[PDB]
Amino acid sequence: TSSKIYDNKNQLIADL
Amino acid sequence: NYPAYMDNYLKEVINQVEEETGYNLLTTGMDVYTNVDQEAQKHLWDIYNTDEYVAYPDDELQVASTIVDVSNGKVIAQLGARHQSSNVSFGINQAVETNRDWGSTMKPITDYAPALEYGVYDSTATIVHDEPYNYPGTNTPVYNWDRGYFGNITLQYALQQSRNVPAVETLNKVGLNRAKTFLNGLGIDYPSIHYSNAISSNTTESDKKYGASSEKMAAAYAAFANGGTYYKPMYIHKVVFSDGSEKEFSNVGTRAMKETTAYMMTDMMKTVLSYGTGQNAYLAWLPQAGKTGTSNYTDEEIENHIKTSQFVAPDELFAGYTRKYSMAVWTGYSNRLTPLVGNGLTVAAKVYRSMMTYLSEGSNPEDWNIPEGLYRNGEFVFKN
Numbered sequence A: 001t002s003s004k005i006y007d008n009k010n011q012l013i014a015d016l
Numbered sequence B: 001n002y003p004a005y006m007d008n009y010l011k012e013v014i015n016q017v018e019e020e021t022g023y024n025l026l027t028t029g030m031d032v033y034t035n036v037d038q039e040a041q042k043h044l045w046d047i048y049n050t051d052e053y054v055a056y057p058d059d060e061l062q063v064a065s066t067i068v069d070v071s072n073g074k075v076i077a078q079l080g081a082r083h084q085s086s087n088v089s090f091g092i093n094q095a096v097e098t099n100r101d102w103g104s105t106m107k108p109i110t111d112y113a114p115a116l117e118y119g120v121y122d123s124t125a126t127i128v129h130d131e132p133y134n135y136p137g138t139n140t141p142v143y144n145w146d147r148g149y150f151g152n153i154t155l156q157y158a159l160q161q162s163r164n165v166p167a168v169e170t171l172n173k174v175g176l177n178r179a180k181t182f183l184n185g186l187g188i189d190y191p192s193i194h195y196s197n198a199i200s201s202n203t204t205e206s207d208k209k210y211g212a213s214s215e216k217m218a219a220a221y222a223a224f225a226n227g228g229t230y231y232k233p234m235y236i237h238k239v240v241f242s243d244g245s246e247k248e249f250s251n252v253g254t255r256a257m258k259e260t261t262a263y264m265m266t267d268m269m270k271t272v273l274s275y276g277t278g279q280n281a282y283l284a285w286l287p288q289a290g291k292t293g294t295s296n297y298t299d300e301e302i303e304n305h306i307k308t309s310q311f312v313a314p315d316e317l318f319a320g321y322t323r324k325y326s327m328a329v330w331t332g333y334s335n336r337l338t339p340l341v342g343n344g345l346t347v348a349a350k351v352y353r354s355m356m357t358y359l360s361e362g363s364n365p366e367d368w369n370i371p372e373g374l375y376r377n378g379e380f381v382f383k384n
């Protein structure tokens, strides 16, 4: 449904 | 929805998630934590698509590279394409694709390192042979780019000027089995390994892991940097499923080569940047090592499709590492039959310099300590 991607610092960058 | 620059990295994230968990992250709700250094990644994207850092000859020359954290094997930046005026989601990530020849950059990991590793050579000063020579078992000559033969030269200088004769012959002295094994330990494989492979990542399959991509090269050169330890490239750190559960991914290493081997290789490769080929990647203030690559066209190609007197190539490559980061660059045109000319050839090395400049400035650039069992002498290093 809705997935969230976080960079090396843990801050959201993408929603898939 | 997601940012322009991240496209390549996410594609691999999705691929890795369902390889380890068996869930397509698009069909299942889960929060996923990655190893992408956003600032570094934006900087990567900036080197490809501006006029700021690198002077390109034209808008369709491709660059593809992968940057790894040498200590854990975490891919921190990846970009397989530049200028993409057809935004279809999750395109062909050229940065992990292996369908292009990595040429000479295969020499260090396929020839000289194993040679040293299994003690076929004793020193960076061992005298090796660049004379008229034939691919073993056949009457086919091994030519050099200049068609000449440097004669008796040291291993170091052999790697530096990048001569094909001492390269190939050194594969023959290692043995084809030993070499296939060594490449496996560095995450690279062929269905079948041949003498041609001593100067080429050209494979028969490329259906999967076969051959070399900027991913697998970065992962291999990171082993040179850290003292001989290969880590599987990683993109994901942690997954949290909708059902609250969490799987953390610890990235464990394997002994790819002796610390003395890793050091001797580094030492020679230093000279590649300084005195030889990749001088367009030389930084006076940064302890780094690398190998350049300039693949060539086939006999068929030379006659029928390539029409020039100049020095031309389908692929130009660089594979360098510092104390902390490993980076491997591929350059070329989507259609291989478009050759690289004159200035086009410097792009690979220039790209690396630019990106390596960014990651290194600030932290003290530490050099490599000469480890137990090796000593210094003249220009070279010897064993015990």
Ligand SMILES: *C(=O)[C@@H]([C@@H]1NC(C(=O)[O-])=C(SC2Cn3cnc[n+]3C2)[C@@H]1C)[C@@H](C)O
Residues within 6 Å of the ligand: B102, B103, B104, B105, B144, B145, B161, B162, B164, B199, B200, B276, B277, B291, B292, B293, B294, B295, B296
């Ligand atoms: C490897 O890719 C290739 C040889 N290695 C290189 C290279 O290291 O870039 C070259 S071009 C070489 C011409 N020259 C003179 N002084 C420095 N350099 C760079 C050749 C083509 C193998 C496969 O032949």
Ligand SMILES: [Zn+2]
Residues within 6 Å of the ligand: B042, B043, B046
């Ligand atoms: Zn920048």
Ligand SMILES: [Zn+2]
Residues within 6 Å of the ligand: B046, B052
């Ligand atoms: Zn800038």
Ligand SMILES: [Zn+2]
Residues within 6 Å of the ligand: B129, B169
């Ligand atoms: Zn010989």
Ligand SMILES: [Zn+2]
Residues within 6 Å of the ligand: B193, B194, B195
């Ligand atoms: Zn064969």
